[PDB]
Each structure stands twice: as structure tokens, then as C-alpha cells.
Design a protein around this ligand. Structure first.
Ligand SMILES: NC(=O)c1ccc[n+]([C@@H]2O[C@H](COP(=O)([O-])OP(=O)(O)OC[C@H]3O[C@@H](n4cnc5c(N)ncnc54)[C@H](O)[C@@H]3O)[C@@H](O)[C@H]2O)c1
Ligand SMILES: NC(=O)c1ccc[n+]([C@@H]2O[C@H](COP(=O)([O-])OP(=O)(O)OC[C@H]3O[C@@H](n4cnc5c(N)ncnc54)[C@H](O)[C@@H]3O)[C@@H](O)[C@H]2O)c1
Lengths: 363, 365
């Protein structure tokens, strides 16, 4: 059963989508849209076979060429493109890239519109499918840690990469760092702890990065490091640590979950495309029972092709298997617009916390 | 020539016995006097000393005994100020090593602050963690610029519930100052030390979620926190985060400290003390230096002298603390951990406890 995919936005992440679809039988890209032909040229080369291209998504939407959509355009364009999809005579499934939107007003508007749209809308927050992360989720959800109380997430990575039109350098286009980069983490918090946030507090700064990059004399206004503490309805708690100038760290992600029977932790290595050649490491998961003492540690292997197709530890592949099911009406949307909105509202509350030096309540 | 120092110990329990074992490694360290209102404690501690000393049920008799050149206080937290006041009113001007927390309440801190200013002999607050060999490496790297400008300091402690103590003194906030004072003053102090700056704002989320639920004390259950996340902002916009869990004793490494600067990151991992871990699964602490450019992390074990490590449960730190205190007693070095350091550490913990209760940040001066 073949699915005809249309890509709206044909840049870096789009090419990751391409390489992952290439690993899933019945995945045919038929249409790609991007206002920049140098992006289309690069992405079509990556596809490796002929597709129809369009400068504007609206022509793609009425092309008759597609069964399902993927949006990989800049964050602040997601709602506009979604609206055109929602108004289309053909109502198609959409995988829309993270952040689903970038402001509080966008979130409010998207919430009304998506509620009235009849086809699957999946927000492409894929980190839960990283095999190490899946192990932690199953351990937490399956009771192996006892009652869960704490979730720590540490991301230590390189500065935001250069992008088409330098779109990721200003809060006005990204929603802020804690939306652009940390929606994934706020979503993992809700997933792992199976609960809703009530309060968020963050300390953060723009302290290091992009100080030498000028746009009409102006520097990037985005955060490059933060600590965020999130309280939950049930009384569980989570903390996110982010540094966008800690690319020295062999393990880019550390996730720890502490319960009253055990702790579990994973370490996720820097993707091979950004690390030292040859010094390739697997992710590790450590299970640490309170009693009896005796931690268990294991490497978590990922299929070599799956890992090579993306920079997110094989997660994008699993994301597509799930989206495929949603497209064929054989499975649910696992990451919904509601999930995306919570993630964004959490990021937005964190950004406001940083500015105001007060915690921010969520309803 | 070993210079002999006559030490008086006030409080003769668990930590006192660690003090004893450490002094035993330092030539010229003679315990002459030990005070404790509980004879079972004196019996235990004298056996640990291994030679005869004069004992007193009350420190006030020890203070005027003429037997001592220097004091160590290892009594319960809420007694430290009272004992210090007796020392300050004595006309003997004896150096004191007073165990952390230096005090337990805001009113105690205000009072101690005025009184300590008028006392002319060394007062050292016994927050020893800086002398843990791996931690000293991180401090030197940070202070020496190997990380570039320092922005972030993460401290994670994953350990066992508070141990049972004499008179169960450590089960209520009223006696301990709260978990973030009793257990975390060490960490707030390391923050000030490493970042060389003062806190402006503290926010914490924490609870009493797991521990001591089956212990009753005149019908009451322990009111102390057993897990927390604390975020601390500093005048120079550096930031630190403390994560504590008192129910994560399965973790091989009880402490993790990471420091992130604009040139490099450094991290250390401190193993559970051998007296609390599995026999035979002994590991050393590890330090990893991670330069941003070029990529290439450097990892090494940080070995500790075997006798020093065996003498205490704080990775050799107590030994170095005593070498430092010895120097202060002899007028050959400064008090490295002052009453001001203790007060800041306590006030930070106190603010954190209040933050947890009130769900708001707390501003510090
Ligand atoms: N899920 C993940 O792990 C992950 C990783 C990286 C990026 N992303 C997301 O993917 C999206 C794209 O980021 P990127 O790194 O690929 O950026 P990029 O700059 O490489 O590519 C963006 C592309 O969008 C095109 N474009 C700009 N305006 C558009 C519009 N109005 N309609 C259609 N296309 C338009 C640009 O011409 C460019 O080709 C962002 O939302 C980003 O957050 C997700
Ligand atoms: N790493 C460290 O720096 C560290 C570690 C453990 C304990 N401590 C500190 O050491 C102190 C004692 O803790 P511990 O674990 O030894 O407890 P413990 O209960 O084992 O010993 C405390 C002793 O103090 C005695 N005592 C009670 N009231 C007294 C008073 N008014 N004057 C004199 N002695 C009195 C008790 O009888 C008991 O023998 C506390 O301040 C604690 O915070 C520090």
C-alpha cells in the first residue's frame, strides 16, 4: 500500500524526513514545495527520483498528487500553512513539524481550527521514539521505578545551526529557544509523568552564542542556556537543563527518572555527523534499584540505516511508521495538536518566567 | 617537630567519630576532652579514640577545664548557636570548628552574625566537600579559566534517607533547619565558592514524598523534604541548579557536579562511600573535561589515599578540612570556610525551604 507524500518546506529537516521515508516500503514522495529553488534542488537530489515541485504550497495542495503532507517550514509559518490545509477542498493528513506554533495567540487560534479539522494532524515531536527513551518511558509507565516523583532532562549541545534566511535567530520567528528547542522536552515531561503542568519557573540567558552575527546591526535575542523547573497537578516534578554551548559533551542528552523503588537514566550520544570520526558510541541505559543495591547497565543498539538516516537517534523513522498508520486509518495520532499546544504553552510560560523572574501558572 | 594541639570535642556521636578517625591521621592531634549529655555516646567515641581522655556531660565544664587549645562541635544542628554563645562569652578565645549548618533559623543567623564579629579566635564552619579531591579539581579548573566564562553549575545528589540519630534529632525541620539546610548547605556554599558570586534569587520545588512514613514521634511524622530541584540566580547572571533525592540510593555515583563555561564543560562523579555500597564493587571518582573546540573529552579517575578514604564517608574531604583547621589554629593559614560562608549557606537553604512552602521565589540580599 503506497502513500504519496507532499513536503511543504524542503530544507534541513525535510531532507531528514526524506531519508527516513526512504526506509519505509510504500513511501513515495510525489510533490515538494519551497519558495527557494536552491532548497528544492538539494532536497530533490536527496530524494533521488523525479518529483513535481512548487514554489507555493497552495498549488501543491490542489495538485491531485498527494495522500499525506509533511510541513518542515520555519516555525512561524506553521499556522498559516495549517490554515490553508484546513480550508482545502481536499482534507489531507498532516505531519507538522515542532513547534506547532510560536505564540499564545497562534495557539488559541490553532486550538479552535484543529478541533474542526477532520483528518489526522500529527505534531512531529519524535524524541519519545529514540530507543533509549522508549525504554525509560516503558520502565516508568510499567511500574519498574515504583511511584515516579522526579524527571531530569539535560541537553548539552552546539549553537543553533545556520538556516535559510537565518530564520532561527530571533524569538519573533522561533517562539523563543524554550519553544523551538525545548517543546520536545516539555512534551516528554507530560508523557513520562502522565500528568499536566501547573507551574513553571525558569532562569536563563543569552550569554554566549551568535554574538558576532549581525542583522542590520542587531544580534540574536534568543536564550542559549536555561534551567527550568516544572510542577505537576499530582505533585511530581521535572527539571530541564539546557546549554547551547556545551558541544564538548560526548552525551548530548541525559534523562534521569527517580521513583520510590528505583532510578533509571539514559545517556544519548552526539549524532555521528557532529562528533569525532571513529569515536562512535551507543546510547546507554542504567537501571538502579534502591534495594537490593546493584545497578544494571546496557547499550541500546539502533539499526545502522535508521541511525544514519537522521540526527535524532533513529526517532524519525519510528515517527513515520506511526504517521503511516494514522494516514491509513489503522492507528491513532500519538502526538496530537493538543500535545503540541501544551508543549508550546509550557515553552512560552518558561520564556515569560525568565523575563519576569516569577513562576508562571498553567491552566 | 610536631606541634601538639589539644582538641576538645563537643558532641560525641557519628560525625565526632569521623573527626576522631581523621585527627588520628594528623600528627600532633591529641584529644584531651570530650563532652556529650549521653554516656553511651561517650563510651562509643572514647573507644574510637583508643586512649584516655577527660569526659564531661556538659560542654561548659569542658570550656573552663584548661585541657584544650581548640574545639570541634559535632552536636545537633539546633544546638550549635547555644554552644557558640558559651564559647564567645568564655574569656579563653579558643578556635572552633563548628559543624554545618552553622545555625538552623533566620533569627539564629541574625544573632550569630552580630556575636561572631566580636570573637577574636578562628571560627571555621565544617563544610568539607570542597576538599574532596575531584571537587577541588573542578574548583581549580573553574577558577583557573579552563572553562572560559562560567555560566552554569549543576549539582545532583542521589542518596539514602537520613540515618537514625541519637534522640532522633534529625527528623523535624524545627531541629534541622530543613533538608535544604541540613543536607544542602554544602551545595549552596559550593555554588558561592565555584561561581565567586552572591545569590540574588532562589526558587525550589520539593516535597516530602517517600521517606520515614512509618516512623512516629509522639504521633507525628517527619516533616522534612526528601526531594527537590532548586534554581539559584547570582548577581553576575550566572545560574546554578541543585537536584536532591533522598530515595535514590541505588545510584552508583551519589554526587554529580557539572560546570558549563563558554570554552568547556567539566563534570565529576563521586561514588557512594564504601561503608554504604556493595562490597567489592569499589570505584574511584571520575573527572571529565569536555572542551568545546576541538572535540575530544578527557576522562580520568581521581584516586584518594586509602587511609584518608577509609577514615570518613565524605571521599577524604574531612582529612583536608582538619589540615586546614590545624593551620588556622597555629596562625599559619586563614579560615577558609568562615561564619559568613556558613550564614550565606544557611540563608540560601532557608530561602529554598520557604520557596517550596510558598510556591514563590525568594529574594536574597
Ligand atoms: N523535529 C526535529 O527534531 C527538528 C529538527 C530540526 C528542525 N526541525 C523543524 O523543522 C522546520 C524547518 O527547520 P530546518 O532546520 O529544516 O530549516 P531550514 O532553514 O533548513 O529549512 C527551512 C526551509 O523552509 C523553506 N521555507 C521558508 N518559508 C517557507 C514557507 N512559507 N513555506 C514553505 N517553505 C518555506 C525555506 O526556503 C527552507 O528550505 C522548523 O519548524 C524546525 O523547528 C525539527
Ligand atoms: N559531612 C558533614 O559535615 C556531616 C555529616 C554528618 C553530620 N554532620 C553534622 O554533625 C552534627 C551531629 O550529627 P551526627 O550525625 O554526629 O549525630 P549523632 O546523633 O550521631 O550525634 C549527635 C550527638 O550530640 C549529642 N548531643 C545532643 N545534644 C547536645 C548538646 N546540647 N551538646 C552536646 N552534645 C549534644 C548527642 O547525645 C549525640 O551523641 C550535626 O550538626 C550534623 O549536621 C556533618
Amino acid at each position: 500500500r503506497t502513500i504519496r507524500y507532499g513536503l511543504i518546506g524542503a530544507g534541513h529537516m525535510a531532507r531528514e524526513h526524506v531519508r527516513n521515508l526512504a526506509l519505509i516500503p510504500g513511501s513515495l514522495i510525489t510533490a515538494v514545495s519551497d519558495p527557494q529553488p536552491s532548497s528544492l534542488e538539494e532536497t530533490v537530489a536527496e530524494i533521488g527520483y523525479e518529483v513535481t515541485t512548487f514554489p507555493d504550497h497552495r498549488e501543491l495542495l490542489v495538485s491531485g498528487l498527494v495522500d499525506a503532507l509533511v510541513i518542515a517550514s520555519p516555525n512561524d509559518t506553521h499556522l498559516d500553512i495549517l490554515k490553508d490545509i484546513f480550508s482545502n477542498q481536499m482534507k489531507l493528513p498532516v505531519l507538522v513539524e515542532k513547534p506547532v506554533c510560536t505564540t499564545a495567540a497562534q495557539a488559541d487560534e490553532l486550538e479552535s481550527l484543529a478541533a474542526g479539522y477532520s483528518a489526522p494532524v500529527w505534531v512531529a515531536m519524535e524524541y519519545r521514539y529514540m530507543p533509549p527513551v522508549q525504554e525509560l518511558i516503558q520502565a516508568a509507565h510499567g511500574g519498574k521505578l515504583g511511584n515516579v516523583f522526579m524527571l531530569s532532562i539535560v541537553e548539552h549541545r552546539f549553537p543553533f545551526l545556520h538556516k535559510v534566511d537565518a530564520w532561527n535567530r530571533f524569538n519573533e520567528r522561533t517562539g523563543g529557544t524554550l519553544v523551538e528547542k525545548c517543546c520536545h522536552f516539555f512534551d516528554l515531561m507530560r508523557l513520562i509523568l502522565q500528568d499536566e503542568p501547573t507551574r513553571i519557573y525558569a532562569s536563563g540567558g543569552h550569554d554566549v552564542n551568535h554574538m558576532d552575527e549581525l542583522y542590520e546591526g542587531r544580534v540574536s535575542d534568543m536564550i542559549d542556556n536555561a534551567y527550568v523547573v516544572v510542577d505537576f497537578k499530582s505533585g511530581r516534578r521535572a527539571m530541564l537543563e539546557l546549554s547551547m554551548f556545551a558541544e564538548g559533551s560526548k552525551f548530548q542528552e541525559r534523562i534521569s527518572i527517580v521513583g520510590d523503588a528505583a532510578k533509571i537514566e539514559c545517556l544519548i550520544p552526539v549524532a555521528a555527523s557532529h562528533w569525532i570520526e571513529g569515536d562512535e558510541s551507543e546510547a546507554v541505559v542504567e537501571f538502579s534499584p534502591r534495594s537490593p543495591l546493584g545497578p544494571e547497565t546496557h547499550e541500546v543498539p539502533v539499526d545502522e540505516a535508521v541511525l544514519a538516516a537522521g540526527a535524532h537517534h533513529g526517532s524519525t523513522y519510528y515517527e513515520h511508521l506511526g504517521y503511516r498508520k494514522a494516514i491509513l486509518g489503522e492507528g491513532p495520532v500519538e502526538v496530537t495538536v493538543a500535545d503540541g499546544l501544551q508543549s508550546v504553552r509550557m515553552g512560552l510560560a518558561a520564556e515569560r518566567s525568565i523575563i519576569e523572574g516569577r513562576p508562571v501558572e498553567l491552566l
